[PDB]
Write a protein that binds this ligand. Structure first.
Ligand SMILES: Cc1cn([C@H]2C[C@H](O)[C@@H](COP(=O)(O)OP(=O)(O)O[C@H]3O[C@@H](C)C(=O)[C@@H](O)[C@H]3O)O2)c(=O)[nH]c1=O
Ligand SMILES: Cc1cn([C@H]2C[C@H](O)[C@@H](COP(=O)(O)OP(=O)(O)O[C@H]3O[C@@H](C)C(=O)[C@@H](O)[C@H]3O)O2)c(=O)[nH]c1=O
Lengths: 184, 184
């Protein structure tokens, strides 16, 4: 009896989870998600309808993404390698509007971040490759997808990069925070 | 055009899924699960409440597992390495009671097996290591867990294994199919 750990971040609706891992002669086992435990920690019901999996090379940066309608809460983790994962509060009425939190998530540390609807999300790959898995509370709606550019000068996100990031065209063309659609 | 594929196996309630993978110069993206797409293929609504993650060395065999109350449907895949994954029908009244189907699931082939409640499940690891992920329709209930021994001589599972498998103590002590608690 050790157990799952949940820790609210500086933007308290963002939660850092750490599973309890059971090792034995075969390798290991852990629960990567448990609805009862998760809901207890969050303080409200959450339902996931899609799971996504990406593989990215060192220096790849994906984000900052959100859906302005059909907004998605995201529970994210790394199953290979290491990333720095960032959540940006885009709720206009929030006292932390325009602030961000970031944590290193890796296959080894098994940490996860819960990033509710109303946030933008992104990550950068620190390892040779990283595989990133996340669960979403609503479906992909490309018509509603929005992007804020990684290096926005108002957000001032400290990405641990040693070189220019490798971006998709969509992400390279992200809007400035000042011009971005935000949530109430 | 390409999209997710679903194929019913010889025991038709067991479904083999293969996601559509989008490659680009960052790596790839795929939806590992989509509730709409899944429910359409299966023909009935589903709710998953727990996700499990295990890591196992070559020759590790886990199974054959089921819960006789709080029975779990399982949607399983490999995110590292390769396994041979087996589903055994333990519904006494089923036309396929005592039959099994098996498929190789790997990180590279991205194949998944949907194994309904009423089945036993196991896998053997073919690669140096494998990481095996699965979603379950009900919670872990150790009081209700049962195991049938991997090499039961009535099931006659053709495990593509050269040498003796590495088993947990529990799995070494699995019951004979002839003596096992089964579902109606
Ligand atoms: C996001 C997504 C993409 N796709 C397809 C569209 C395209 O062909 C390919 C790649 O899409 P993208 O370039 O938009 O994928 P990507 O840049 O990996 O987008 C993701 O980034 C992380 C950080 C998030 O927060 C996610 O919500 C999502 O925005 O996958 C889906 O089929 N379903 C999905 O849910
Ligand atoms: C199955 C399970 C185990 N545990 C703990 C108990 C124990 O300390 C550790 C390892 O348990 P086991 O040895 O029973 O794990 P394992 O032998 O990997 O069991 C699994 O095998 C595959 C084939 C399946 O079908 C799964 O549903 C499950 O039965 O993990 C959980 O916390 N939650 C769970 O859901």
């Amino acid at each position: 009896s050790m157990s799952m750990k949940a820790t609210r971040l500086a933007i308290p609706d963002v939660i850092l989870f750490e599973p309890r891992v059971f090792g034995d002669d075969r390798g290991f086992f852990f629960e990567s998600y448990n609805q009862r435990a998760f809901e207890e920690a969050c303080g409200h019901p959450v339902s996931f309808v899609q799971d996504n999996h990406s593989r990215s090379a060192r220096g790849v940066l994906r984000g900052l993404h959100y859906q302005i309608r059909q907004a998605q809460g995201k529970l994210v983790r790394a199953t290979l390698g290491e990333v720095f994962d960032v959540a940006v509060d885009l709720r206009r009425g929030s006292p932390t509007f325009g602030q961000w939190v970031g944590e290193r998530l890796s296959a080894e540390n098994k940490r996860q971040m819960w990033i509710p609807a109303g946030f933008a999300h992104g990550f950068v790959v620190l390892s040779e490759y990283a595989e990133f898995l996340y669960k979403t509370t609503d479906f992909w709606a490309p018509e509603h997808e929005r992007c804020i550019v990684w290096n926005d000068p108002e957000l001032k996100i400290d990405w641990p990069l040693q070189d220019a990031p490798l971006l998709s065209e969509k992400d390279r063309q992200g809007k400035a925070f000042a011009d971005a659609d935000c949530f109430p």
